[PDB]
Amino acid sequence: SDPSSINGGIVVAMTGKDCVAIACDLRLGSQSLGVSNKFEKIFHYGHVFLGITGLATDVTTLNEMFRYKTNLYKLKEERAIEPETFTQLVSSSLYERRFGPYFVGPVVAGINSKSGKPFIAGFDLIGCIDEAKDFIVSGTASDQLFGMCESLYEPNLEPEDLFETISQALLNAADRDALSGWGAVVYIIKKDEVVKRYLKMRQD
């Protein structure tokens, strides 16, 4: 009944030293029924990464919408959109549906190509920006993720240390949530290389 917890799923993003990480589970369900273990919730438009939790039809719709908009942006601006600018675009786009919203919990992650500064941001379903320095969490196990991140996180982690932190944050949060899990992906993002890692986890 609650649109934000029909399909389930989680996204978490973290900042490190000259790097950001964004991670998500792979589950899509119809309440109790597991439907897909390959439903990735992280997308990218150039070097800007967007994770989206919540109602799966809206996740798909918004990805297509932001691909649409960032493609036109690039053709007109003659450059790839930056994380700070894209964050405002997500906020604008969500709030235009103020009284008929997309039931989603978006998370932006990326590195500004000009300043080199790591950037993360979160949103409620209606566009309010949470621009945290440390970490952003979203999804049906957001409480669990908040608990994991708050204790596990420390600032200025190196890319390969940040990977372990965000992975353990996701995995242990997901294992305490019925509607999250069934696989997981972690993106480690540096200024001009991005590594994608699929994690091994329990399949119940």
Partner: peptide, 12 residues
């Protein structure tokens, strides 16, 4: 510490 299944470079 974390178990990994696959690695790949993402073309940005």
């Amino acid at each position: 510490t974390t178990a990994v299944l696959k690695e790949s470079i993402v073309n940005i």
